[PDB]
Amino acid sequence: GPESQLDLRVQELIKLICNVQAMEEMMMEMKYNTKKAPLGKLTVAQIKAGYQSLKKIEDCIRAGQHGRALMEACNEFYTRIPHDFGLRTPPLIRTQKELSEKIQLLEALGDIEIAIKLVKSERQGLEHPLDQHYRNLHCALRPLDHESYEFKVISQYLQSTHAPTHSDYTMTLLDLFEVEKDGEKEAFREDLHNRMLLWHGSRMSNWVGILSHGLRIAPPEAPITGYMFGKGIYFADMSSKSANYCFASRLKNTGLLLLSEVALGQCNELLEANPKAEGLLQGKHSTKGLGKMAPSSAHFVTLNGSTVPLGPASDTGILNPDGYTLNYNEYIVYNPNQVRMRYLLKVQFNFLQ
Numbered sequence: 144g145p146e147s148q149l150d151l152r153v154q155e156l157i158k159l160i161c162n163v164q165a166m167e168e169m170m171m172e173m174k175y176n177t178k179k180a181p182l183g184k185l186t187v188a189q190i191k192a193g194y195q196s197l198k199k200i201e202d203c204i205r206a207g208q209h210g211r212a213l214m215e216a217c218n219e220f221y222t223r224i225p226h227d228f229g230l231r232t233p234p235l236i237r238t239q240k241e242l243s244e245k246i247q248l249l250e251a252l253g254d255i256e257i258a259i260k261l262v263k264s265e266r267q268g269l270e271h272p273l274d275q276h277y278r279n280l281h282c283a284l285r286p287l288d289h290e291s292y293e294f295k296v297i298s299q300y301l302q303s304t305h306a307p308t309h310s311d312y313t314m315t316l317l318d319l320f321e322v323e324k325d326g327e328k329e330a331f332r333e334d335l336h337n338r339m340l341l342w343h344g345s346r347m348s349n350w351v352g353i354l355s356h357g358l359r360i361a362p363p364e365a366p367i368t369g370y371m372f373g374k375g376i377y378f379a380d381m382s383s384k385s386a387n388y389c390f391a392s393r394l395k396n397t398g399l400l401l402l403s404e405v406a407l408g409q410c411n412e413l414l415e416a417n418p419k420a421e422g423l424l425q426g427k428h429s430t431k432g433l434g435k436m437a438p439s440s441a442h443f444v445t446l447n448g449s450t451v452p453l454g455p456a457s458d459t460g461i462l463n464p465d466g467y468t469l470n471y472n473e474y475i476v477y478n479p480n481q482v483r484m485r486y487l488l489k490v491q492f493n494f495l496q
């Protein structure tokens with residue numbers, strides 16, 4: 144009956160992130176089974192078991208047990224987390240990247256279970272359904288105007304920090320929302336210095352969970368080696384580096400990027416990955432993974448109290464002698480109270496070919 148009371152741009156955002164059918168299609172692309180394991184009846188416990196099975200696998204990988212041991216651990220994961228490979232013979236997880244794949248799958252399942260719950264919630268017919276979904280986020284989203292000063296600056300942040308080795312696409316900013324998640328400013332470590340406005344990209348299936356529950360710490364059951372710098376919340380200062388984690392396609396060229404205030408405090412700087420980076424803090428507040436190019440310094444503005452690392456980017460003269468060197472920086476915090484969500488960008492990806 145009742146007409147939406149939401150701004151239209153917010154109505155389109157809600158419609159886009161609460162699209163269960165699109166999640167269904169995103170999981171199907173990660174080789175998952177949407178009917179045998181219907182997202183409508185996902186539970187935390189199915190996902191917890193998921194993590195547990197990935198831990199057994201990590202154990203085999205750490206022991207070099209790539210025979211029967213690993214074969215059975217992978218089958219238990221594929222049983223608790225139903226996959227649909229049709230005729231293909233379900234493959235072994237042995238590499239870090241294969242492992243990382245599964246973790247990203249469980250994170251999306253977790254955020255999809257949050258989303259499903261919310262969209263099925265009550266169904267009070269006093270308010271438009273968009274309106275209900277938006278209240279249930281407990282997260283304010285305010286459409287800023289194309290002319291607005293904020294749009295100007297974030298546009299420049301997005302374009303100015305597009306990395307040159309991500310030449311497979313450009314990005315156009317369609318819309319910009321101010322985010323105010325209930326409780327985040329109250330929780331936030333305003334005491335800590337070195338507060339930066341940084342990027343976070345995720346699959347389109349995770350935004351309801353991200354906006355409703357915040358960026359979360361990975362559960363204890365998950366394998367530590369899933370995480371290059373441990374179980375924390377990961378941000379970049381380069382737009383495209385985050386944007387790659389949106390997993391946008393030529394057919395699905397619309398994604399979302401997040402800007403958050405991040406209370407870095409004192410960074411523990413690392414050159415190479417280390418899943419156990421969190422124990423190496425010793426009083427420091429964050430991990431910084433160090434890359435070859437990063438925004439300058441001289442272009443850094445500020446915005447409601449956070450330093451926006453605008454570009455152009457520049458060589459940092461960083462290089463790792465004995466192993467891999469990250470192309471771009473990477474920042475990890477190990478507590479949600481070091482994150483305050485600020486903006487949500489609606490972004491068109493324009494793929495070269």
Ligand SMILES: O=C(c1cc(Cc2n[nH]c(=O)c3ccccc23)ccc1F)N1CCn2nc(C(F)(F)F)nc2C1
Nearest residue numbers: 250342343344359360361362375376377378379385388
């Ligand atoms: O931030 C992360 C996280 C993200 C990535 C990939 C990634 N993505 N995007 C970016 O821009 C980005 C920028 C730099 C580096 C990497 C990234 C790799 C590991 C991570 F730990 N997490 C917090 C949210 N979260 N929630 C859960 C759960 F499962 F509990 F629900 N697990 C997590 C994990």
